[PDB]
Amino acid sequence: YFGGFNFSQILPDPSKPSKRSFIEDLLFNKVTLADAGFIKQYGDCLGDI
């Protein structure tokens, strides 16, 4: 209760394992990102699609 101000959509929630807020999840979903690090890990290109 911050004087009537809500602050529910910018504070983190314990339900999500990433501990990100409601606005932050929408920000992360709106950007389609590739090459986030080492995802292929020298084995996935051997599984020739």
Place this chain on the structure above:
Amino acid sequence: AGCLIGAEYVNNSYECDIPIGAGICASYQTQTSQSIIAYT
């Protein structure tokens, strides 16, 4: 970032001395007796 050979993983957390990647750092600290450790 790949797997680390030569340094063991401890459950303690300190400041980052040598950055490796993905929130994991390495440092040369005491154990007893001196060895390279890896930590978050």
